[PDB]
Amino acid sequence: SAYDTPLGITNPPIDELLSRASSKYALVIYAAKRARQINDYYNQEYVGPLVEPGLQEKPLSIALREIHGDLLEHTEG
C-alpha cells in the first residue's frame, strides 16, 4: 500500500492522526498543548522531545509526529 511521500505540512496524514484521538478538535488541542510543552523545555511542563527532532522543526510539527507514533496519552477531560 502506498499513497505517496507527503510534503511538509501534509505530513503526517490527518487520517493516521485522527485514529489517535476522538475528533479533529481534540487533535488540535493535543498538538497545541504538547507544542507549548516542548518549547518551554527549550527555554527551561518540561519533557521531550521523545522523537529524534530534525533541526529547526517547529515544536508543533514535532508534537504531531509524536502523536503519530502513539508516544503520548492523550486523556480527555
Binding site: 510534503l7 511538509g8 505540512i9 501534509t10
Partner: protein, 65 residues
C-alpha cells in the same frame, strides 16, 4: 449634517457591533492581487517575498539575532 448621538455609536453598520465588535482590522496580515499557481501543490501558496518578510518581521528578527 445631523450630529451623531450616543445611539448613533451603537446602532448602524458603523455601530460598534458590526464595525468594531465582530469585525475589526488585525495585525500580521496583508493582501495583494492573485496570479495562477499551476505548479503549486494543493497545500501550497505563492507568497511575495516582500510581503512574507514584513508579515514574519519579528520572527526573522529573532532568529537573525
Amino acid at each position: 449634517r445631523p450630529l451623531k448621538s450616543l445611539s448613533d455609536l451603537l446602532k448602524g453598520k458603523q455601530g460598534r457591533f458590526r464595525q468594531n465588535l465582530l469585525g475589526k482590522r488585525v495585525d500580521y496580515s496583508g493582501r495583494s492581487v492573485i496570479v495562477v499557481g499551476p505548479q503549486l501543490k494543493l497545500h501550497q501558496c505563492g507568497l511575495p517575498k516582500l510581503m512574507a518578510l514584513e508579515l514574519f518581521k519579528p520572527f526573522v528578527m529573532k532568529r537573525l539575532v
